[PDB]
Swiss-Prot record:
Similarity comment: Belongs to the helicase family. RecQ subfamily.
Protein name, as recorded: Bifunctional 3'-5' exonuclease/ATP-dependent helicase WRN
Binding site for Zn(2+) 1: 40, 42, 171
Tissues expressed in: Expressed ubiquitously in most organs at a low level, highly expressed in testis, ovary and spleen.
Residues in 3'-5' exonuclease domain copies: 15-184
Included stretch of the parent chain: 37 to 225 of 1401
Originating gene: Wrn
Organism lineage: Eukaryota, Metazoa, Chordata, Craniata, Vertebrata
Subcellular location per the Swiss-Prot or TrEMBL entry: Nucleus, Nucleolus; Nucleus; Nucleus, Nucleoplasm; Chromosome
Coiled coil, from the record: none
Subunit relationships: Monomer, and homooligomer. May exist as homodimer, homotrimer, homotetramer and/or homohexamer. Homotetramer, or homohexamer, when bound to DNA. Interacts via its N-terminal domain with WRNIP1. Interacts with EXO1, PCNA and SUPV3L1. Interacts with PML (isoform PML-4). Interacts (via KBM motif) with XRCC5 and XRCC6; promoting recruitment to DNA damage sites. Interacts with RECQL5; this interaction stimulates WRN helicase activity on DNA fork duplexes.
Positions marked as site (Interaction with DNA): 100
Length: 186
């Protein structure tokens, strides 16, 4: 039985473009070249495809932002700047796929992403095909709630439920903690 990893800080939920741009600029102002944030995204699972509904940025153990873009009529300009900011790193798992998706859906270019599975394969010197949960178990010795119920819930629904918020925040948080873990190994 492995302990369950959960974001323990404050979750800042933003579903309006202006509010989101303001918070994003605030993040940009508090960070500098070399800094990193935990990053992740969610979206609901005939002919039409589902677009990114939520973007998570965990700047620290005490604060994680959830940007409900599916509820925004215009993509947050401040969020766009932050994401395209090469000075700030975004750590995650399967994050190149996130970048691709962001470009396709909103023509937003995620800059300076850090694929944690590659960092792990090179540091831990192992050739493994990972899942975020699997990486948390091996690196953090913890577990992640991953039942379809929440993982595959309708992320475009407003508002996000308390379970959705904690799950989305925890996925970004896991990225930040794994990044710190691997980046400071000795
Ligand atoms: Zn993800
Ligand atoms: Zn996720």
């Amino acid at each position: 039985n492995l302990p369950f990893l959960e974001f323990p800080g404050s979750i800042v939920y933003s579903y309006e473009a202006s509010d989101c741009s303001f918070l994003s600029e605030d993040i940009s102002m508090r960070l500098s070249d070399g800094d990193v944030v935990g990053f992740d995204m969610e979206w609901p699972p005939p002919g039409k495809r589902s677009r990114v509904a939520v973007i998570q940025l965990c700047v620290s153990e005490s604060k994680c932002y959830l940007f409900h873009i599916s509820s925004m009529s215009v993509f947050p300009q401040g969020l766009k700047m932050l994401l395209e900011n090469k000075s700030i790193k975004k750590a995650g798992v399967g994050i190149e796929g996130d970048q691709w998706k962001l470009l396709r859906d909103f023509d937003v270019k995620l800059e300076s992403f850090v694929e944690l599975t590659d960092v792990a394969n090179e540091k831990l010197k192992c050739a493994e095909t990972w899942s975020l949960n699997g990486l948390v178990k091996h690196v953090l010795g913890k577990q992640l709630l991953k039942d379809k119920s929440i993982r595959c819930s309708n992320w475009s629904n407003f508002p996000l439920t308390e379970d959705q918020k904690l799950y989305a925040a925890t996925d970004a948080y896991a990225g930040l903690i794994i990044y710190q873990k691997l980046g400071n190994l000795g």
